[PDB]
Amino acid sequence: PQSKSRKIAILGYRSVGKSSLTIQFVEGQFVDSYDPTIENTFTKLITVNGQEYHLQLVDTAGQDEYSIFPQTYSIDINGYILVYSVTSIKSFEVIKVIHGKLLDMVGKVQIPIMLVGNKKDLHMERVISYEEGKALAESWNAAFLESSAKENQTAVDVFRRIILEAEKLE
Numbered sequence: 001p002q003s004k005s006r007k008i009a010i011l012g013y014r015s016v017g018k019s020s021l022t023i024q025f026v027e028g029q030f031v032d033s034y035d036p037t038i039e040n041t042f043t044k045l046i047t048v049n050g051q052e053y054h055l056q057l058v059d060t061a062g063q064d065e066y067s068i069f070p071q072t073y074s075i076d077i078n079g080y081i082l083v084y085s086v087t088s089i090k091s092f093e094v095i096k097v098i099h100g101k102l103l104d105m106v107g108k109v110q111i112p113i114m115l116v117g118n119k120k121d122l123h124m125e126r127v128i129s130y131e132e133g134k135a136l137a138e139s140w141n142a143a144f145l146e147s148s149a150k151e152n153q154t155a156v157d158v159f160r161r162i163i164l165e166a167e168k169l170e
């Protein structure tokens with residue numbers, strides 16, 4: 001087809017950089033601040049392996065270990081990006097809980113789930129190694145990338161990759 005519309009939900013604990021990553025990709029800017037309590041859907045046209053997509057990104061407000069994941073929430077979602085911050089242990093423990101709840105929601109439907117460790121630019125504050133995030137992702141059979149919302153190419157790589165994974169499963 002000439003174009004495919006795909007919707008990806010961006011999940012994770014408060015403050016890990018879900019809005020900033022999404023805005024870096026969509027607008028090519030690192031925003032000073034963006035309301036942490038707001039959920040918006042952003043869109044961007046991207047081409048992956050010659051195929052054009054209208055990618056819709058649902059920048060969720062945030063989840064924690066008491067968040068819920070009714071099957072209702074999964075309607076029209078084609079893939080999930082689970083974000084933690086490499087500077088926050090809490091955020092990494094939370095993404096593990098979110099993933100298990102997510103799996104319960106989506107069951108065995110063929111939709112991609114990838115893991116993203118964000119804020120990789122904060123070297124002095126890092127508390128999670130690359131390898132710890134990669135091993136988690138492997139245990140999930142999930143793609144893994146680290147990012148910085150201050151680095152446009154790392155934002156682009158994240159959203160290109162979730163579309164590549166979606167295509168492999170379709």
Ligand SMILES: Nc1nc2c(ncn2[C@@H]2O[C@H](COP(=O)(O)OP(=O)(O)O)[C@@H](O)[C@H]2O)c(=O)[nH]1
Nearest residue numbers: 014015016017018019020036118119148149150
């Ligand atoms: N240094 C750095 N700060 C980041 C990065 N991503 C987000 N931030 C900052 O982290 C805070 C939370 O970011 P936000 O995008 O609002 O997180 P959200 O709650 O997941 O949407 C804000 O002060 C952002 O400026 C990143 O990759 N590097």
Ligand SMILES: Cc1cc2nc(CO)[nH]c2cc1C
Nearest residue numbers: 009058060061062073074077
């Ligand atoms: C697509 C989606 C959006 C959500 N928003 C919240 C509350 O921030 N939880 C969510 C779960 C899903 C799957």
Ligand SMILES: [Mg+2]
Nearest residue numbers: 018019035036
């Ligand atoms: Mg936000």
